[PDB]
Design a protein around this ligand. Structure first.
Ligand code: GTP
Ligand code: GTP
Ligand code: GDP
Ligand code: MG
Ligand code: MG
Lengths: 427, 84, 439, 52, 90, 440
């Protein structure tokens, strides 16, 4: 009864978002036509946290699927689990965002955000007592970034006591899949430093780094990368759907991690990621997952955690394990590695243990680090972008759509302000 | 086989039926539900029931097979589950 | 006559409370569904159940309990457990959303959507009883469900219920091994409002139980089931002079006159002497003078403060089983001759002894043995000064740069309440120094 | 089966005799004849291969 | 006798040569002697080093050679499809 | 009452304790799972066992002994053998990493990690005494916890336990035949410590038992467990007056009053007299005259020293069996008439006798016979000084070049404590010189 409705924004958000319903419905015995064919009652006893219910023994997800072009939504119904979404919630338009943040924020998505805020609030008034919202998008384009930023400011000003999530595969230096990629990103953190409860930042550069080095996956398509993300969107909503010897909901990890009200960019990584060759030679135990949460190789975001200082660490486990051995191994790390951990916070790890594991795995774990290594993902975009605003490299495709030159120096100052609040608390 | 009236959670097809107590209607759903496939391996409504291994001393320091994945038990109990 | 209610608050309070009540149905003849079977020769007197049970008609016994929390996911497996039919359904009162490790979201925001309803159930339990010996409170000093809603409950019980005995049970947050990051933030706003409404107040930290479960019991890798099985045996010993007749018995209202020197010092320490394993304690005997030594051992204490560098103010033992008053007074003569144990100068009497005939009841599925005799202790020592003064630093590392304060401040409290509750914790730091200085 | 249930005799009666030694002789005789049949069959197969 | 594995694409296993070229001795009943031509046939299981491989087909040159020697080959069996690779392909 | 707690230290200390706790269990009626049989009675009843054993409520006898080692794989056969149900688990104290034949790796570095545990378990064995006679120590002068942690054991037992009797039996290094090269740095530096802490101290050489076997019990090729079964026949016979009633008793305290003239000389010798085999036992009549004659004899002595190079200071005969107090005295008066068996001038009495009824127990699997009577001796001769000088040479051979000295100096240890300990062994050779010179 702490239900959360889901939003999927853009081509990046829909492919990430449609995988999350392919894995959660597999966690709850639900066939591709939506009905129940499960095996336990623990599947069905909190299925009403991401679902409505319809007559006849069928459940529909509480997801609204948003776009500006109608091409991507044909691809989601043509997917294997596309039948389960209610057709009233597919909300989209006629023309495209142009890979412009500005043309998807000011011009085009404004005629469509009235329509989204009618099918969003139909979900939010049918709830028992609503808990949160979700959003999946990328910080490098028009539909993911631009209108997906506008929708957040309208959810927040009407529901400012709920909890809010955001997912982001933020742009990278070494890979580059848009030439206006820093103009989209640097402007769009303006409403993620001020106007969100949470935001996870993931990097497509280090998605490839896990897939070649840890999993030995020879050619990873975008199917396997989105599988690697969807086991961490699952991992935060585990104590909300399943029992535990210790519990950690959404609100608990909101309070404990975030120290100061504008430092909420996190660094996820699933623990028992392992390859098919070394699955048979490897032992799962609670020390052994802690060895693999914490190393700089399995971080999904492409920053090196041993270049800054950890502030707080979460670890949302999954399985029947001993509560000494969970708490033994966090005393282990802070006293072994003690330079990398912050000095004025004495117990730096929040822990939690669930009961029902991911399917097939006897044990699993997750990790949500908050480090001062995140400034090299903000400062590195800053010189990536300020090379271009010196000569006004692309501005006539944004300035001509309704905005002026002061709104980048307003949002470069704020981008530098976030970097300045890490070298404060890091040293 | 019913849930007691203060129970919070999901039961199938409560929201359409009417005019009955929670325990009576929950008994009616768990008895008759032909449309939905009720699962066989269900772990909630428990039945009420009342509330070598000795060839080595409790201080033995050596390797015992399969006995680092067992927990919450004594030395003799973990060795009993590892062997037998 | 002699009824007493027990409320369990928090997820830690409920999960301890499942362990205490599988102890108390097996203590007596009662089956899990509440029915007492006929003619099966149990060890009580006649009304040995009555201090923790009502009596409805056709051989059905209902507990004197109420389980409360703000989150519904942890009482719903009590509404479907083996013990689902044992409780009346209108006791297990659950909220809608959780405080999630705030006082200020439990004591100030969402506790008032529920405190009106438990204090109507507290009437209908205490309206039935003849005369209350005293409530029992079960909680933990971690979060805000088990520590913030607890604090408003005792502001409302100390006014409405006079001066009946209110024996809380706590879990002090273990200093080294811990779960939350804001554990010291919760546990110093607590001592300001539980210096005034708990007539007795116990402490057990989770880290010390982990050592005993490694050494004496030989459970390498314990979980939270084993730890709550031994808290129940300690509560079962403080209540065994209510229901079973004794050779020398002490009740609830006689600890308070005897443990507590001054009205601000009511934090005892609890030990259980033959916490020991069945495959190993076949070999050693358990004489009365042998298990009196294991109470005073530094390693066996249940809060990680060494009693060797603190001087005792009193002790309060409780012997069950096959014990005679000769062998008790012989052992107390031995302890007072050792130079390691220091008693305080103005306490020449020293001790306080209870003797019973009812042995401690073994629980199947548990981890201890079937011993003939056992001992609890309720020490009151000077050594508690170092368990405040090493959680009063972890508070002051974090509050000097105002980390995490911006969450509590928005939900109904100000910047002075963190300050008002910090000299109120270094005021009590001085009483344990000024009292134990010799004459 | 004959040796297995002759070895359960009570004390003193358990004595070596002609029956025990003849039983030990005939079990090895039977194993030797079985090995000879195994050799003859295993070489009949290779002459069948030659005929094919 | 040599044993090889052809490299399949997205399988994470270390793939390639499995047993190096050497004479292989028999299972421990009659341990001392090594493998010869006669022990090899189709639709049978052959044990190398604790691992029992299953044979399901031959080559055309192998069919001609073994039929030349004099063994009549069994009917060819079939290889069950790998579930992980089937799931990944579909 | 009359209780004595034995502490066994080192692999040689544990492997001796096993052989002499199979003797004690068979000496009384005790089965290898603690509990006596109920259908039969092997030993006739009393509370004889209550000076080695101890009883719980349900009738189970658990010994009051603690085995220690700094290496975890000699205790792990005690924990799995036939006598694993007999010992309560925390008496079998074990270490983590070895002592590596150093002292400074068992006296300063690694011995500090296991002196906390053994001094809380032995206060729980001396709590349940009423009157403790005195400890027993079993070790060897070769190793690193058998002779390095044993020194730190006794330096604290002389502090918290006052002056309860710390009796030690010991193995002295044989000098020709010795397994380790590192040995004289051990057996100098441990004699310097057990001078001021031990109350009695018996030496037995491993080489000197090898030829007591091969001549008397005609065993060419003896193993260490043929060799340990003779030591239990000594340890039991000096304590068989505590348990088993006798015509003339002697406790542990009456040895030290009657064998040790001066406070450094507490080094007896040993001899078990009818050390005979069962193919030669029932043809000889082992009369008391011919098992007291065969006990002074220089072949049969158990240390590699000869009594014909010094002079006796005191004896301590321990008869056991079918012995009469008169025939004891008729054979003491024969030994004194000799001009070769030399007794010191200032001891005209000479002897201390003890007569006990219970005959010595035969062990299944053992080598000796069940004899009808038997004799011990704890002679205190002047001729121990020759075994001080053979150790003094082999120490001083190495130390004038500093061989193996970097292994001890580098482990928390002063480099001049090898020369404190050689003047404690050069003063002690003159003390045996000056209590042998005659008064004129
Ligand atoms: N002894 C014992 N301690 C527990 C148990 N479960 C949790 N704890 C301790 O409880 C502390 C956390 O405080 P909680 O009482 O669980 O907080 P809460 O009352 O549940 O608050 P909410 O989670 O918001 O409902 C941690 O330090 C744990 O060590 C238990 O079953 N037994
Ligand atoms: N008499 C006798 N001597 C033994 C026996 N076993 C070993 N020794 C002697 O023991 C000496 C060596 O010391 P250790 O047996 O290793 O004693 P330790 O305490 O384990 O020494 P470390 O290995 O350094 O720990 C040598 O002099 C051996 O002759 C035995 O069973 N009987
Ligand atoms: N994880 C993931 N990222 C993608 C995928 N396709 C594209 N991207 C990333 O998304 C960025 C493109 O921006 P996008 O949000 O898709 O533009 P828009 O959706 O048209 O508004 C590129 O930088 C890609 O790195 C995908 O299938 N999975
Ligand atoms: Mg909780
Ligand atoms: Mg050794």
């Amino acid at each position: 009864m702490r239900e959360i409705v889901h939003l999927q924004a853009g081509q990046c958000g829909n492919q990430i978002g449609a995988k999350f319903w392919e894995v959660i419905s597999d966690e709850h015995g639900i066939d591709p036509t939506g009905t129940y064919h499960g095996d336990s009652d623990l599947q069905l006893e909190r299925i009403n946290v991401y679902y409505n219910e319809a007559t006849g023994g069928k459940y529909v997800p509480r997801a609204v699927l948003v776009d500006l072009e109608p091409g991507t939504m044909d691809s989601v119904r043509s997917g294997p689990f596309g039948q389960i979404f209610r057709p009233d919630n597919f909300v989209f338009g006629q023309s495209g965002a142009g890979n412009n943040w500005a043309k998807g924020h000011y011009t085009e998505g404004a005629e469509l955000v009235d329509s989204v805020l009618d099918v969003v609030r139909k979900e939010a008034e049918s709830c028992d007592c609503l808990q949160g919202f979700q959003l999946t998008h990328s910080l490098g384009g028009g539909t993911g970034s631009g209108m997906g930023t506008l929708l957040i400011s309208k959810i927040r000003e009407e529901y400012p006591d709920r909890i809010m999530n955001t997912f982001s595969v933020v742009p990278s230096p070494k890979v580059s899949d848009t030439v206006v990629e820093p103009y989209n990103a640097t402007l769009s953190v303006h409403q993620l430093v001020e106007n969100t409860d949470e935001t996870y930042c993931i990097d497509n550069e280090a998605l490839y780094d896990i897939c070649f080095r840890t999993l030995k996956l020879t050619t990873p398509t975008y199917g396997d990368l989105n599988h690697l993300v969807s086991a961490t969107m699952s991992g935060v909503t585990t104590c909300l759907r399943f029992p535990g010897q210790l519990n950690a909901d959404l609100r608990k990890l909101a309070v404990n991690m975030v120290p100061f009200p504008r430092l909420h960019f996190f660094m996820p990584g699933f623990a028992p990621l392992t390859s098919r060759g070394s699955q048979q030679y490897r032992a799962l135990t609670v020390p052994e997952l802690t060895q693999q949460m914490f190393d700089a190789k399995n971080m999904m975001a492409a920053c090196d955690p041993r270049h800054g200082r950890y502030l707080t660490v979460a670890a949302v486990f999954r399985g029947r394990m001993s509560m000494k051995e969970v708490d033994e191994q966090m005393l282990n790390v802070q006293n072994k590695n003690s330079s990398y951990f912050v000095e004025w916070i004495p117990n730096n790890v929040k822990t939690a243990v669930c009961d029902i594991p991911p399917r097939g795995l006897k044990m699993s774990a997750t990790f949500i680090g908050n480090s001062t290594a995140i400034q090299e993902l903000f400062k590195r975009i800053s010189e990536q972008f300020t090379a271009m605003f010196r000569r006004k490299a692309f501005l006539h495709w944004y300035t001509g759509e309704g905005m002026d030159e002061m709104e980048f120096t307003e949002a470069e100052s704020n981008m530098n302000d976030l970097v300045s609040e890490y070298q404060q608390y890091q040293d | 086989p019913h849930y007691i009236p203060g129970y919070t959670g999901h039961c199938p097809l409560l929201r359409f039926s009417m005019g009955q107590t929670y325990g009576q209607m929950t008994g009616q759903l768990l008895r008759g539900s032909p449309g939905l496939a009720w699962p066989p391996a269900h772990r909630t409504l428990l039945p009420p029931i009342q509330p070598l291994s000795s060839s080595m001393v409790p201080g033995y320091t050596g390797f015992v097979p399969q006995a680092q994945f067992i927990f919450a038990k004594n030395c003799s109990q973990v060795w009993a589950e590892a062997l037998n | 006559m002699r009824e007493c209610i027990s409320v369990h608050v928090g997820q830690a309070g409920v999960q301890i409370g499942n362990a205490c009540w599988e102890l108390y149905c097996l203590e007596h003849g009662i089956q899990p569904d509440g029915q007492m079977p006929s003619d099966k020769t149990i060890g009580g007197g006649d009304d040995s159940f009555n201090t923790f049970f009502s009596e409805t008609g056709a051989g059905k016994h209902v507990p004197r309990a109420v389980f409360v929390d703000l989150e519904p996911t942890v009482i719903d497996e009590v509404r479907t457990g083996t013990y689902r039919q044992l409780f009346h359904p209108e006791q297990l009162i659950t909220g809608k959303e959780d405080a999630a490790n705030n006082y200020a979201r439990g004591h100030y925001t969402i506790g008032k959507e529920l405190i009106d309803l438990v204090l109507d159930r507290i009437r209908k339990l205490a309206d039935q009883c003849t005369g209350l010996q005293g409530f029992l409170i079960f909680h933990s000093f971690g979060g805000g469900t088990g520590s913030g809603f607890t604090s408003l409950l005792m502001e409302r019980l100390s006014v409405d219920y006079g001066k009946k005995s209110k024996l809380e049970f706590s879990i002090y947050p273990a200093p080294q091994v811990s779960t939350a990051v804001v554990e010291p933030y919760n546990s110093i706003l607590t001592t300001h409002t539980t210096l005034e409404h708990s007539d007795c107040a116990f402490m057990v930290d989770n880290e010390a139980i982990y050592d005993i479960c490694r050494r004496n019991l030989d459970i390498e890798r314990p979980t939270y089931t084993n730890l709550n099985r031994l808290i129940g045996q300690i509560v079962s010993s403080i209540t065994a002079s209510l229901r079973f007749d004794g050779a020398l018995n002490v009740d609830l209202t006689e600890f308070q006159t005897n443990l507590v020197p001054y009205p601000r010092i009511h934090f005892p320490l609890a030990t259980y002497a033959p916490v020991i394993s069945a495959e190993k304690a076949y070999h050693e005997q358990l004489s009365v003078a042998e298990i009196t030594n294991a109470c005073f051992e530094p390693a066996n204490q249940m809060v990680k403060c060494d009693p060797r560098h603190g001087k005792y103010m009193a002790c309060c033992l409780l012997y069950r089983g096959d014990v005679v008053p000769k062998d008790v007074n012989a052992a107390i003569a031995t302890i007072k001759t050792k130079r390691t144990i220091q008693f305080v100068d103005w306490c020449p009497t020293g001790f306080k002894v209870g003797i019973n005939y009812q042995p401690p009841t073994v629980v199947p599925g548990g981890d201890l043995a079937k011993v003939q005799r056992a001992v609890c202790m309720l020490s009151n020592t000077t050594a508690i000064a170092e368990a405040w003064a090493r959680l009063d630093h972890k508070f002051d590392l974090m509050y000097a740069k105002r980390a995490f304060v911006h969450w509590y401040v928005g939900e109904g409290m100000e910047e002075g309440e963190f300050s008002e509750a910090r000299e109120d914790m270094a005021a009590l730091e001085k009483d344990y120094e000024e009292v134990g200085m010799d004459s | 089966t004959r040796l297995e249930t002759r070895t359960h005799r009570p004390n003193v009666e358990l004595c070596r005799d002609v029956a025990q030694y003849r039983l030990i002789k005939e079990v090895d005789e039977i194993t030797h004849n079985v090995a000879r049949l195994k050799e003859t069959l295993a070489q009949a197969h290779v002459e069948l291969k030659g005929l094919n | 006798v040599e044993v090889n594995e052809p490299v399949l694409q997205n399988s994470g296993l270390p793939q390639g040569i499995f047993i190096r070229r050497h004479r292989i001795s028999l299972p421990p009943p009659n341990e001392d002697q090594f493998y010869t031509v006669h022990h090899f046939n189709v639709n049978t299981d052959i044990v190398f080093y604790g691992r029992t491989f299953k044979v399901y087909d031959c080559d055309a040159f192998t069919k001609n050679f073994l039929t030349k020697i004099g063994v009549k080959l069994n009917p060819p069996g079939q290889c069950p499809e790998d579930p992980y690779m089937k799931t990944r392909r579909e």
